[PDB]
Amino acid sequence: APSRNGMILKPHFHKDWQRRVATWFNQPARKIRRRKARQARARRIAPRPASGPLRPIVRCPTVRYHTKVRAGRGFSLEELRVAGIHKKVARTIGISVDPRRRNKSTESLQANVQRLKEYRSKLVLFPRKPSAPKKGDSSAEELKLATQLTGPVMPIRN
Amino acid sequence: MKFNPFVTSDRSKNRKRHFNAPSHIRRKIMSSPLSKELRQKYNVRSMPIRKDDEVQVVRGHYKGQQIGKVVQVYRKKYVIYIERVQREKANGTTVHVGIHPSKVVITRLKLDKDRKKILERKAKSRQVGKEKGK
């Protein structure tokens, strides 16, 4: 029964909720586990960025977010076509590619081509064998860095 | 402290480990120090006590400077019986009184081949650590 003034309030504890309470005593143990697993994955992908692949710049949807810009899922095909990277290869050099992205405006396209161009400049493709063929960079830019890149690769700053 | 996160430091766990210990493991638990004399000679602190070592009792009632030969090792009872360490029961019969190995000192070892190789292994590890410390 209500007594003199207060929010006529509806709690949702009518089902058997104590049967499905989910505690968080994991979380520290979890946080570590992720972190180990993270450091392992770095070490496996030895000079490759820990991050992942490079990802496009992309505007959010809706009037609300609109003004901001994130990393997207992957670079469109037009953006790869214009940059001149064969889509099947782009995956092999650490360039995210989605193929479901349309491309409406040319301002978002040329920006994302520029991204890939810049990436290709500051990328150090190792040759397949220690014996060096084409494409593969010099042993100078190799000895001076077989270095991983900490954090997201070429980060987007709005 | 102990930092190894697979050891135990848990009364109940250590005691259970102890009392329900298997024979070969008890051998190690039932170890006893060498006399300073042997400590000098072999480069070994202590040794797993055995059926017919010569031994002094260091503490208790039977604490004394006599050197009694070991009689048997009752690993179930965590104890060793020693030559003249005994007590007359009600009806005259002598009964070998138990002494815990660690409250005893080995003056003379019973050296077999295996005991010889053990002492060679312990002395070598001791001198490796002194070389590492230096």
Partner: protein, 259 residues
Amino acid sequence: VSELAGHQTSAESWGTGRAVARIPRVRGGGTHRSGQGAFGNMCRGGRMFAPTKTWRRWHRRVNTTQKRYAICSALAASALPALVMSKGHRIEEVPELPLVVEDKVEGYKKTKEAVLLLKKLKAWNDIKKVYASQRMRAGKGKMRNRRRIQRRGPCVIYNEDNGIVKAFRNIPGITLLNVTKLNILKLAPGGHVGRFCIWTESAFRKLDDLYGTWRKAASLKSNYNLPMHKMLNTDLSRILKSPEIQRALRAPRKKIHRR
């Protein structure tokens, strides 16, 4: 306490009319446990009233500035010999109270060195008093791996472990902190404010970079400064018998007019 604790029986009440007492009683059988008393918080067997749960709100989370304020407060009173002595630490013969030292002390790799240091600095008599305190705990925590108890010793704030934290380790009483990762649980143990510490010049320099002086930001904790003071002249005895104030007070009526 376990969920099933107390309810693993199947027990119905013999209703009224049997004399007895309307409790659920163990059902059937030819044992002692039959027609007993199940479930009730009062019964043997039974079920504790409001069995304890795991999702009691164990952890407790504190505003970050407040945490810092405490840690500044503890530091500030690690000065002040009175507050250090009152917190028990035998700091009688120590040379200077915010005790800062050479930075070879990063070097040491052996307790030998670390103890010798503490004896020259006259901080050993705290460690000595730690040994003296080592005794058996009172009661049930004895049988739950809290069997021995003792004093807290000298804190030792270092800037970098170059070997130090190995050296001071077996010396009972000592806790080692990084400067860059200070902790109020250790600087104010018991929630009690004083505590004799021992600084390393590298670390003791770094404090102002960590906490920021009054006219400079932290420069290491993004957006932070010291907490400002509410009153500046703390010694009110210096205030109250000033010229300025005693000039302006009526003369103290102090006769005692008894009945």
